[PDB]
From TrEMBL, chain C:
Keywords recorded for this protein, A-Z: Membrane, Transmembrane, Transmembrane helix
Keyword Transmembrane helix tagged: yes
Transmembrane segments annotated in the record for this chain: 59-81
Keyword Nucleus in annotation: no
Organism: Physcomitrium patens
UniProt name for this protein: Photosystem I subunit O
From TrEMBL, chain D:
Residue numbers binding chlorophyll a 4: 25
Membrane in keyword set: yes
Binding-site residues, chlorophyll a 1: 7, 67
Compartments (UniProt record): Membrane; Plastid, Chloroplast
Protein name (database record): PSI-K
Keyword Calcium among UniProt keywords: no
Family: Belongs to the PsaG/PsaK family.
GO BP, sorted A to Z: photosynthesis
Domain of life: Eukaryota
Gene Ontology CC entries for this record: chloroplast; photosystem I
Binding-site residues for chlorophyll a 7, renumbered to this chain: 67
UniProtKB/TrEMBL annotation, chain E:
Similarity-based family: Belongs to the light-harvesting chlorophyll a/b-binding (LHC) protein family.
Organism of this sequence: Physcomitrium patens (Spreading-leaved earth moss)
Residues the record lists as binding chlorophyll a 3: 47, 49
Domain of life: Eukaryota
Phylogenetic lineage: Eukaryota, Viridiplantae, Streptophyta, Embryophyta, Bryophyta
Chain positions recorded as chlorophyll a 7 binding sites: 146, 169
Keywords, comma-separated and alphabetical: Chlorophyll, Chloroplast, Chromophore, Magnesium, Membrane, Metal-binding, Phosphoprotein, Photosynthesis, Photosystem I, Photosystem II, Plastid, Thylakoid, Transit peptide, Transmembrane, Transmembrane helix
Subcellular locations according to the entry: Plastid, Chloroplast thylakoid membrane
Protein's recorded name: Chlorophyll a-b binding protein, chloroplastic
Residues shown, of full length: 102 to 317 of 318
TrEMBL record, chain G:
The organism of origin for this protein: Physcomitrium patens (Spreading-leaved earth moss)
Domain Photosystem I PsaL reaction centre subunit XI: start-end pairs: 6-156
Binding site for chlorophyll a 2: 50
Protein name as catalogued: Photosystem I reaction center subunit XI, chloroplastic
Membrane topology classification: Multi-pass membrane protein
Family according to the record: Belongs to the PsaL family.
Binding of chlorophyll a 1, residues: 31, 37, 55
Amino acid sequence: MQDVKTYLSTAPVLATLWFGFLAGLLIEINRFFPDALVLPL
Amino acid sequence: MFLISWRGYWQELIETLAWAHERTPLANLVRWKDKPVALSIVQARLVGLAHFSVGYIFTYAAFLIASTSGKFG
Amino acid sequence: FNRDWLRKDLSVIGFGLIGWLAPSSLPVINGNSLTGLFLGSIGPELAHFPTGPALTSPFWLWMVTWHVGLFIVLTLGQIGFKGRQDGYW
Amino acid sequence: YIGSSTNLIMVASTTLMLFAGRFGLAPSANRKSTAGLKLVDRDSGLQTGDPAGFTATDTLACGALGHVIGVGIVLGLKATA
Amino acid sequence: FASKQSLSYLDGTLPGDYGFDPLGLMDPEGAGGFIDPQWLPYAEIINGRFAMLGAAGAIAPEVLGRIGLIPQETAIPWFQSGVIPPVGNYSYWADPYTLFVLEMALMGFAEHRRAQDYYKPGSMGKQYFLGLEKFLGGSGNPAYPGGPIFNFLGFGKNEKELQELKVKEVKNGRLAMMAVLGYFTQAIFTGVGPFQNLLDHLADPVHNNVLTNLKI
Amino acid sequence: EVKIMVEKDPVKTSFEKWAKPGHFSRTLAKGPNTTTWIWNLHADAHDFDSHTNDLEEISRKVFSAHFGQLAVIFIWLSGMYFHGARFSNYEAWLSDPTHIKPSAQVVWPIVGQKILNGDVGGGFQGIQITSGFFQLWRASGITSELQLYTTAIGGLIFAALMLFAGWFHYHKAAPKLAWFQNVESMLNHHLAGLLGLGSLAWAGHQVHVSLPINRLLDAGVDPKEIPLPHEFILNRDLLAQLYPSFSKGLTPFFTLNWSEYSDFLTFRGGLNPVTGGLWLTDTAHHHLAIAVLFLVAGHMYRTNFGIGHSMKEILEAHKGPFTGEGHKGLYEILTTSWHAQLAINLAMLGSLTIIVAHHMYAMPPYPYLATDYATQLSLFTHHMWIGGFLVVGAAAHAAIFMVRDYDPTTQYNNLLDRVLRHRDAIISHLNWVCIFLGFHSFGLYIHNDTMSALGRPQDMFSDTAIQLQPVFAQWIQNTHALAPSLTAPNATASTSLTWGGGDLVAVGGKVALLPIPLGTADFLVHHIHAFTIHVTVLILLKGVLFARSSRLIPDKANLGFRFPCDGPGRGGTCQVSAWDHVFLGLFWMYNAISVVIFHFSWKMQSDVWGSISDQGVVTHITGGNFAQSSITINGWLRDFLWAQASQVIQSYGSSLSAYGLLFLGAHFVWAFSLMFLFSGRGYWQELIESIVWAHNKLKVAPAIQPRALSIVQGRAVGVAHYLLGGIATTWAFFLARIISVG
Amino acid sequence: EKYQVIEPLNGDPFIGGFETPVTSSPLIAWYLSNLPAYRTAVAPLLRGVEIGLAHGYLLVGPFVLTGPLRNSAVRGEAGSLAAAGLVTILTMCLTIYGIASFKEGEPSKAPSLTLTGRQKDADKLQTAEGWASFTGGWFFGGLSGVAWAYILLYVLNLPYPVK
Ligand SMILES: CCCCCCCCCCCCCCCC(=O)OC[C@H](COP(=O)(O)OC[C@@H](O)CO)OC(=O)CCCCCCCCCCCCCCC
Ligand SMILES: CC(/C=C/C=C(C)/C=C/[C@@]12O[C@]1(C)C[C@@H](O)CC2(C)C)=C\C=C\C=C(C)\C=C\C=C(C)\C=C\[C@@]12O[C@]1(C)C[C@@H](O)CC2(C)C
Ligand SMILES: CC1=C(/C=C/C(C)=C/C=C/C(C)=C/C=C/C=C(C)/C=C/C=C(C)/C=C/C2=C(C)CCCC2(C)C)C(C)(C)CCC1
């Protein structure tokens, strides 16, 4: 299990997880707050 | 063609061509004075850039002149 | 270089001619009959060469088949000799 | 159908192929043909009760070739005649 | 002693050994996976015993119906009982899929236990089963467990009678395997039960064979 | 001799090596020092023969990796079937094939993506697809989504099975080297089973399922009312109602009365008038005949049972007085090196794929495929590109074999040595052929351009001016058109409608196929094709033949297969390796295939495809301008690229906007590749030095030292981005134009 | 099975080239040896005369049948003039080549050894005076051949299949 954790810490896997989470967050934000051109605050 | 393909390919091809010329009847009667070789690396870059620039200039000059003279407006 | 590189037999010609004319002549109105007829049916040959046959003619197919068969038979006959005496089997 | 021409052709083809197999008139498992078609002897580790060396592999091969030749002959004769 | 060459590894110690191996499947030179020489005899015995059961049970109901022991509502052929609903179906106390689940549960217990005894010979008689682990320790050869359940009458007390019984088992098993294959093929070609096929071949042997049934 | 030989538990299953990124290589395992290590790791991953020296491990790795690729393909097929079962209008299309556009991809509403969901018909919104899966499913007899869902589940199960098989045969029971070298047994088993039995099984499926269902569909029966496929097996009365010869059973088969089955095993040419596709009864007789032929062919080679041919003796027998030892020594090469087998198989597979493209446009095998112009264009272009890539790979891996696995001891006076001994003559004569073809074809085009510009159209090489007719192709067309009367009398019609003889097939007011005239322009364009193909062959063959040595570099085989140069000496030795020859052959293959697909698109749109109205008058998409406008380069530029790109550049704001976006993006990527192609490594290394100083000034320099891409990597990146850009540009252009006007 | 046709050039494996049916063959060798170019003992002027005659005669057809004036009433004259101009340009090329290649003192460059090892006098064509004489002969012969072809084609009728 230690070897699995070491493999999951490699650069491509971590990059995939991080960019997937970031893309999901941005997609959900644009789903709930669409067509945002200027910052209201 | 000069920009992408480099020298060794052309040098070997010219070697085969020289072998062919030296072994052809009625053509051995004619001999070159200078041994044919491929262009130099820097010379190849320069010739590629020259063909490139001439094509660029001529193409845009033709387009500009024609597209402005067909209408004159 | 051997002067007679193509080791001269010159009797393979007759054997090839016979062994190609025997099969081709067999079928009804098929084989060398067509080539012979078109050799005869030149056209207005009273003086010289009547203009060549058009695309829409069977002469081309018949001549192609006949000469292809003749050349195949001749080559296999030449290999049959000169290959039996050199070994190879 | 038993006395029909097709049955006779098929049985004759199969029988002739088997006959040419068992007796040295055709290649088989224990009798290899060379480049000159000479039928030299070949030793295979197959045991058979036939004293001439005819095995079950040869039986299957000769029967298959006989069925093939018989079918071809029957169809050709039907198409021509 | 019969069939093909003596392959130099089928010496004859196995029951039913006649040196029949044209494809050399049991050659111990490269013998990994399921082609191990210690797995093939066991697998032959297992498909053989299941084939004996299958042949007897696929021919029994129709014969019993012809004699009259069982109601004619249950004298249906083997393929009209629920194995193939598109061909025929019978209504039991449960739908066939619940029956399949229950059957898979019971056979899963039995078969995973038998597998664990094959792979770990001494096991299945150590951990606490519901009191029956005492009789479930297979002695020696995995294919012949024995004991107070699997051999509860005491046959083959001496070695020679046991050899004869093993040989008899192998032959009846091979015969039943071929019989089951025949059941399948004859069901496909004729569309009736194997017993009806037997009666048809008996009534008119020359006009009721495989050559006649080429048209279905 | 031939037997199963395996080893038990060779490699233990663990995750330890998953944490050692470069374990397979003895130099990469030590870890990285520069950024070159990452590229070397991802570049040497699947190059098994460079890691070890024993053929056994290489063979086992190849077997398991091929299992993995099979599993990936099964996942892909399952995905296609599922996405067609749940996100498609396949049933509505089944009802009305000629008006409903196929669609199997649906996009989510997120950022305005809604506009891509087009109005394809059938109360459905989605992306129109051009893969031709609807036609294939209809030809298979599928009439519901339940069958597609079942097929998807089966595909997933098969993917799992392939994954397990790969794991089993690498980590648990690995075959020995003697198992892989049974080439006679491998050919027997594959040629008989995989081909003949597969074809026989498909013929059985066609006869027992597809013929009745498609017969009912063509008659006019509503898809919902057609009985299910098993009802034609359980009840032969229906199948005898459709094809009466089924009422006889299998008696005609065994009594050799094969003429009784002539109502569903036919030999008729042409296309079905209703659907514009090949008759399925012909497809039945032909998959059956293929099955028989392959099953007979697979019983040829010698094995444990004595009978059969031996390939070594056959190869050693055929030799003559012109070739010395002949084909001797090839058996050991082909049973010892994986790369030679890969080269041969890649060449054959690429050529076969090109043949598939040609035969598939000329004789459309699926119903309602000929009148779906987008599908025809897409399939032709796709499989043509695939074939080109494979034929380039053949030369690449043949050169790899020549550099690595060649052994002069075994090859003394056989064909390989004698080919390597007269290579200068080969390359010289092929150079002359390339120059001759280029001049006497492209100079003809330039001559036409100059005559047209000078106002002398009577001096051109056109149909109205000086003519160049393709008499040989015209004769072949006429001969093939008259076959059903003389040389293939049992045929009803000719093989295809493209031959000169024949008529017009129209399905739903659109032309399916039509006789294709050949004139001066066709002469010019096939001789262009010949020029480009001989040039690509010249490049690749020069790369393969001079891979080990030349006059310039006598010891090229010591430097390896993939090296940048041998220094600026001898005048300069850039790109002397076989890898760079493949690198240039890729560009020339791109050129050739682009010209081929442009020829196909213009000729089809100009002379075959079109709309037909009452009284049988045909109007073509571009109105037959190929014959006059394709004889000049200006004609191509104006009447093909400028005229036909109006659809892709005006697709903004519609459902086709993605095609315009990818058109622009592909022009961009193609331009982007030129910066890798035209430049060198030293400039970028020095610029990286300056940038590294900048990062060092703020204590943020990386531990792994940044390095400029290697020379070979620069060339590879350039060619990859170049090919992607060009092919994607053509993809977007074709799809937009043909979806708009098709 | 030991009989082979292909042989190294003159039996030397280490000289670049092979000796094939195309290269060495009694018919091909006789034909190539009897061409004027390889008649090393004949005066270069007469060899040039024959070569020029043949080339000038063959050149007339392509220029007349294809050309700007091929459909006019002066097609033959225009084609003949074009062929004569090409002959003049090639004569200029021969002259400048001979000037650039040979000097007045060099003995000769042609090989003086036959294949069978015999020693013979080297060809006088590969000399300044020899090349000059050959060039003059080629010019005169080319003009004569062009004139002869023009006369045959148009001065006299002489019907031809294509003409
Ligand atoms: C479902 C399809 C299959 C998926 C993968 C299945 C893997 C099964 C085990 C493979 C290794 C077999 C050999 C064991 C032995 C082995 O690998 O090396 C042996 C090694 C021993 O380590 P120890 O520290 O226990 O012992 C060291 C000795 O020196 C003294 O005891 O590690 C293990 O035992 C770990 C075994 C599990 C390692 C993987 C754990 C995680 C697996 C699953 C990851 C995904 C989880 C997803 C959850 C949703
Ligand atoms: C298990 C089996 C049958 C089981 C049947 C069962 C349970 C039936 C159950 C039911 O019917 C009932 C009772 C009642 C029904 O209502 C329901 C069902 C459920 C339907 C058959 C095996 C059957 C197994 C068979 C037929 C095996 C054949 C093998 C052969 C011929 C091998 C030959 C060779 O392997 C050798 C020996 C040596 C090699 O070298 C060469 C070759 C030639 C390869
Ligand atoms: C024992 C014995 C014997 C013998 C006997 C006998 C009688 C035998 C026979 C045998 C036989 C008689 C065999 C046979 C076989 C056959 C076969 C084996 C066949 C097969 C077939 C096939 C394979 C076909 C196929 C096909 C084709 C090709 C065509 C189409 C269709 C099909 C696909 C089906 C002896 C004398 C020794 C002694 C005494 C006793």
